[PDB]
Design an enzyme around this catalytic site. Structure first.
Site, PDB file in Angstrom:
ATOM      1  N   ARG H 205       0.831  -1.178   0.000  1.00  0.00           N
ATOM      2  CA  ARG H 205       0.000   0.000   0.000  1.00  0.00           C
ATOM      3  C   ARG H 205       0.862   1.222   0.000  1.00  0.00           C
ATOM      4  N   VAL H 206       2.184   1.040  -0.145  1.00  0.00           N
ATOM      5  CA  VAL H 206       3.146   2.096  -0.049  1.00  0.00           C
ATOM      6  C   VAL H 206       4.349   1.634  -0.810  1.00  0.00           C
TER       7      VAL H 206
END
Lengths: 48, 337, 116, 85, 265, 120, 120, 253
Positions: H205-206
């Site tokens: 997610r990053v």
């Protein structure tokens, strides 16, 4: 009267010394119906 | 089995059948039964007492009674108290059968005691050591060694399933502790198959190790046939193979045959013939409605034609080829009439 | 309907109903195929499968993570886009086209992309 | 919920799925009961709605059968057509 | 509840599983009789084909199609429909006679223009000469079959005992019989109207065969479908079993927590 | 076992019966001791108690005990915490089956269900 | 060879002698026959394979000697013995039916079948 | 992911690959990896140590150990202590990694401790401060700012889902704290995908920025493509378009 219809009626009469089987009787009895159609529009499912 | 599917009746039947051997003077043929009525209403126990008196069974019976009204400590100690009674028979080298009916009510009483004594609660609000309690009771049943005088204390606890939950904490524990189950099934009971034993869910882990040799011989087939009948049962739903139809006919007749009117026991010498007919498929010819008529008639026919055969079965306890030959002839003759 | 207007409410109602049908027949779909659905229903299901996929849209703050340039679609545009889809005025192009894209126009353009 | 259900004299079940189905009120007709029953509704309205309950119950039963598939007899499809309406 | 709602839904799946098992088995039973018939029928047909081959052939169109009334015979209904629709492009104005409710439904939907004759009471029965003959008679009178200078019938050829490929064939008009390359190597009698008779005779004889081929494919398809159904149901049994098991553990834990909290006081 | 391994320099193999009943026994002792039972009513000392049992069975320099244990799965639910904790300790599983025995094969080991850590 | 067949049943499907009742009167085929197409009328049929002779009652069909000596006979539902006495009863009924009775064609067929039976 | 999908191996490989990086020059290119073994048998740990010494990688890594034998409070304090060691590397500005295998076993340990302290049982019988326990641990380990000298300490906590229950209380609490998932799919593990990474349940997610540009360009949209493969084979089980077939042929391959 169509030739195979002509033969058919004869075949039906023909299921009458005697020696009778289920497949014969089934071959001479049918409950099927034929549904005429037009257009969508449907004249009834007259018994075949 | 499921709650009040006349579980008590199934048990009571066993007690009645012990009358036949009990009457017999040999004390290796005397199981002095003990019925332990746990949590059973006094009206119910009155019926029990009356049934026992009617079948004149109160001479090999002791009924330890902790009725519904009776206090929860009495209910707690009731199977334990009963067990001690069993020990005297067992210790004397005699045989006896103690039927704890039902341990589900024993459980409720222990629950009441523990919770009321503020002892730590546990799973399904049943005492933490409930496994330990049930195991102590159930381990007292024992087949003694000959050095300690060959005796026994057969036991048959009756467990009430709480609507069919065999995963429930008190049922699961008991199932583990005991060795074997007979699982009566409610659907069968309602559908009029009484006894309502579900053959599939009945198992014995000692099983055929103790079994009359004769009765073993003519009943290996019976187990297998019923197994097939169960599988091909649902296949009744049309276009049916000839093979399936053979199974269905033999199987339906067998199922009908194993129906038995409650509170009527039978002797081994009359068990063995009936099963012989079914195994040999003689009953296949007989129609379902006539199975019942066949059964009693076959027995009377066997008694009239050859109570010699019956007596041989009874005393020999092993079916000889000559007996199986003669028996087949007798059955053929009976089937003909 | 008094707030977001009758036209919106009607559009939204139909979306809810179609998707609810799709959920209802989700069981039936699994047990037996789509060709063992009733014909009327089979249309509903095919449309609904498209509607469901249509609802996804890339997000711009997720543009880094997803790797898809985001799409912000006008409210006026949204009502129009779904309105058309419910009337099947764009039902004739891949399910993949509906998946992860912005407005109705974008779905059309992606149909051309897919067509290549 | 158990306590209240016993205390009260009727239940007027609503159902979320039926809400989504667009039936508003979302009253779940089968689960909704009135244990004080009809003798509280308008006499006229009682007369007209006499078999309305039976029809709806039949619709529910028929609908279950209908979702197990297979062609249904015309009498059943009368129920289905009526039921939908 | 979770626990009961899981348990009842799992039971539903169980009942579904049981039904799909049962149907698949019964279908297998039905299939054996169907298959036996189809052999004998095909033998009769081959003798007729022997003439048509040796004669050669050299033929608007008619469309006849064959499926059962019965449903859930796999994708017979819609695979055949797709291949009809493909050839409905080819000749637009052709009149479709649908023998069987299932094919009736798909084609009727796609073009309701063409439906002129349709049959009923097909699927239940195994095809017999009687049905074929009467249908044939109605094709000749009602549809004036000779008027279409092409005739084509669609059916499902049962490629393998686990497969079906939808198939079609062209019935040769009475005109065709006349002008077929060879026809004089066989001794035609002008006295008999052998084209006008043979056309009729092969209209039915071919059609009966088509019905037989189709019927075997149909029963085979239902067996196949119902088997795959059992598998799909099995997967759902497993999924809800896991759900049941998880839910069961959770109920014990949640109940336990309530008891403990009380005891703590 | 440890006397054999450690103090007689042997490789020995120690069978345990139901390890369900090991858990069951442990659960009771906790409850009696008055500890708050954990999930699915299993001892709060569930991890540590299995840990002591399953860490004296090990490969020493001197010798090694090896232990064949029986997992009487409770309710046949393998996601139950008691089987799971057991399975964590287990290294291999030999899966006797009655079907296999019915195919006349004695060994009764089901070849497709037997799996081991060392089998790589 | 000879192909003698029905739809649901299949018989002999060139055979020595076959005697056929046709719109061309009666036709006989013996070994190789020059290749014909003849419509078989409702019939009393003889098929002889060697000197052995089998006697058939046939519902009409089609006959085609193929050039390769394949006598394709195709006919609907036939036996001669099977057809027989019950048929005599039927013929009385059939006369009644002929009185009332496509229905005309049916009655014509009934008369034909009555004749065909008299041939038996 | 799911218990004993040789869960440890997935992480072990990460540690091994960094040999080339760690045998480099520049402290930024060197990672110093700490393997926290909580709740593992002494035998299992001994195999790990030997494995690391087989790949000659022991010299760049620390093992902090709290084996199954070791007492429940020691297990409770085990990740935190390891993380302190890690922070020294991080605050030396050097890049590092810490693999906490398994925080799911830390949960069981804290459960024991909490219950034995008679603090009221929490949801799923896991103590109520369990969220705090994991969160305080987890949000330590960081890539610090230029001010702090661009420290790094990568964190891989290894969570053992019980029967692949990703809604389970201990897993969900961890999932929400952590970023990305590397769900190891059991079905795929059985069906010979090693490493069995279900891309549907694996996200980062990053992550995308972290990758080197080459592996962004070349690998562009492959995640999408293989989440089209999932869809493609989803509906593979009516009419398969030639487009669908091409995707399937590529996807399977």
């Amino acid at each position: 009267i169509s030739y195979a219809a002509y033969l058919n009626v004869a075949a039906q009469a023909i299921r009458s010394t005697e020696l009778q089987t289920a497949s014969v009787l089934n071959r001479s009895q049918t409950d099927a119906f034929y549904t005429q159609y037009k257009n969508a529009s449907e004249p009834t499912p007259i018994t075949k | 089995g499921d709650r009040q599917t006349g579980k008590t009746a199934v048990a009571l039947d066993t007690i009645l059948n012990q009358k036949r051997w009990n009457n017999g003077s040999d004390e290796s043929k005397k199981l002095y039964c003990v019925y332990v009525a746990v949590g059973q209403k006094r009206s119910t126990v009155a019926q029990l007492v009356q049934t026992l008196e009617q079948h004149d069974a109160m001479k090999y019976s002791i009924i330890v009674a902790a009725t519904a009204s009776e206090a929860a400590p009495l209910q707690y100690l009731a199977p334990f108290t009963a067990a001690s009674i069993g020990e005297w028979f067992r210790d004397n080298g005699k045989h006896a059968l103690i039927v704890y009916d039902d341990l589900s009510k024993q459980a409720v009483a222990y629950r009441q005691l523990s919770l009321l004594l503020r002892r730590p609660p546990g799973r399904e609000a049943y005492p933490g050591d409930v496994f330990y309690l049930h195991s102590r009771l159930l381990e007292r049943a024992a087949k003694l060694s000959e050095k300690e005088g060959s005796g026994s204390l057969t036991a048959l606890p009756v467990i009430e399933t709480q609507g069919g939950d065999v995963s429930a904490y008190i049922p699961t524990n008991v199932i583990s502790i005991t060795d074997g189950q007979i699982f009566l099934e409610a659907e069968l009971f309602y559908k009029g198959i009484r006894p309502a034993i579900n053959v599939g869910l009945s198992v014995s882990r000692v099983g055929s190790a103790a079994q009359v040799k004769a009765l073993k011989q003519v009943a290996g087939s019976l187990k297998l046939f019923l197994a097939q009948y169960r599988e091909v049962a649902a296949f009744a739903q049309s276009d049916l193979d000839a093979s399936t139809k053979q199974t269905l006919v033999r199987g339906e007749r067998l199922t009908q045959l194993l129906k038995q009117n409650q509170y009527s026991p039978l002797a081994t010498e009359e068990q063995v013939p009936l099963i012989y007919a079914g195994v040999n498929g003689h009953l296949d010819g007989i129609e379902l409605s006539r199975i019942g008529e066949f059964e009693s008639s076959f027995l009377s026919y066997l008694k009239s034609n050859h109570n010699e055969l019956l007596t041989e079965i009874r005393e020999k306890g092993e079916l000889s080829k000559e007996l199986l030959a003669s028996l087949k002839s007798a059955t053929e003759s009976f089937v003909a009439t | 309907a008094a707030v977001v207007g009758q036209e919106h409410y009607d559009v939204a109602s139909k979306v809810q109903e179609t998707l609810q049908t799709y959920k209802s027949l989700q069981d039936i779909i699994a047990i037996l195929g789509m060709d063992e659905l009733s014909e009327q229903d089979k249309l509903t299901v095919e449309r609904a499968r498209k509607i469901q996929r249509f609802l996804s849209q890339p997000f711009a703050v997720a543009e880094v993570f997803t790797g898809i340039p985001g799409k912000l679609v006008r409210l006026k545009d949204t009502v129009a886009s779904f309105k058309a889809v419910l009337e099947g005025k764009y039902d004739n192009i891949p399910e993949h086209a509906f998946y992860m894209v912005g407005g109705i126009e974008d779905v059309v353009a992606k149909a051309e992309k897919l067509a290549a | 919920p158990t306590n209240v259900i016993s205390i009260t004299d009727g239940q007027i079940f609503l159902e979320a799925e039926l809400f989504y189905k667009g039936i508003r009120p979302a009253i779940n007709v089968g689960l909704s009961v009135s244990r004080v029953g009809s003798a509280a509704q308008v006499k006229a309205l009682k007369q007209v709605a006499g078999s309305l309950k039976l029809f709806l119950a039949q619709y529910r039963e028929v609908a279950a059968f209908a979702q197990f598939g297979s062609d249904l007899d015309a009498s059943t499809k009368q129920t289905l057509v009526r039921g939908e309406r | 509840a979770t626990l009961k709602e899981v348990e009842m839904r799992l039971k539903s799946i169980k009942n579904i599983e049981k039904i799909t098992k049962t149907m698949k088995i019964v279908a297998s039973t039905r299939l054996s009789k169907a298959e036996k018939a189809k052999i004998s029928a095909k033998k009769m047909d081959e003798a007729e084909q022997l003439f048509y081959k040796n004669a050669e052939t050299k033929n608007k169109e008619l469309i006849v199609a064959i499926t059962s009334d019965k449903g859930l015979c796999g994708s017979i209904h819609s695979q055949l429909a797709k291949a009809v629709r493909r050839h409905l492009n080819d000749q637009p104005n052709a009149d479709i006679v649908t023998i069987g409710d299932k094919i009736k439904m798909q084609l009727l939907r796609t073009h309701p223009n063409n439906i002129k004759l349709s049959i009923n009471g097909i699927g239940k029965d195994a095809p017999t000469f009687q049905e074929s003959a009467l249908i044939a008679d109605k094709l000749l009178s009602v549809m004036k079959a000779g008027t279409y200078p092409k005739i084509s019938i669609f059916y499902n050829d049962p490629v393998s005992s686990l497969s079906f490929e939808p198939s079609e064939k062209p019935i040769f008009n009475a005109k065709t019989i006349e002008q077929s390359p060879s026809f004089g190597k066989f001794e035609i009698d002008t006295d008999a109207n052998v084209p006008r008779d043979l056309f009729e005779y092969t209209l039915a004889n071919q059609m009966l065969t088509a019905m037989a081929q189709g019927y075997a494919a149909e029963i085979s398809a239902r067996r196949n479908a119902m088997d795959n159904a059992s598998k799909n149901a099995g997967d759902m049994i497993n999924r809800y079993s896991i759900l049941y098991n998880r839910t069961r553990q959770a109920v014990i834990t949640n109940e336990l927590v309530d008891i403990i909290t009380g005891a703590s006081s | 076992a440890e006397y054999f391994r450690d103090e007689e320099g042997q490789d020995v193999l120690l069978f345990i019966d139901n390890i369900f009943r090991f858990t069951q026994a442990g659960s009771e002792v906790s409850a009696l001791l008055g500890r708050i039972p954990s999930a699915v009513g299993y001892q709060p000392t569930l991890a540590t108690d299995m840990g002591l049992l399953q860490e004296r069975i090990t490969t020493t320099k001197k010798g090694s005990v090896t232990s064949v244990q029986a997992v009487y799965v409770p309710a046949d639910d393998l996601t139950d915490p008691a089987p799971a904790t057991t399975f964590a300790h287990l290294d291999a599983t030999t899966v006797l089956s009655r079907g296999i025995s019915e195919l006349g094969i004695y060994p009764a080991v089901d070849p497709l269900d037997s799996k081991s850590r060392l089998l790589d | 060879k000879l192909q003698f067949a029905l739809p649901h049943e299949t018989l002999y499907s060139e055979v020595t002698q076959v005697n056929l009742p046709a719109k061309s009167g009666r036709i006989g085929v013996l070994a190789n026959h020059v290749p014909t197409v003849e419509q078989l009328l409702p019939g009393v049929v003889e098929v002889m394979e060697g000197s052995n002779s089998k006697k058939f009652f046939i519902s009409g069909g089609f006959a085609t000697v193929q050039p390769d000596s394949q006598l394709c006979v195709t006919a609907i539902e036939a036996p001669l013995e099977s057809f027989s006495e019950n048929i005599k009863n039927l013929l009385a009924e059939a006369k009644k039916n002929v009185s009332s009775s496509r229905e005309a064609a049916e009655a014509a067929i009934q008369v034909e079948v009555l004749e065909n039976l008299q041939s038996v």
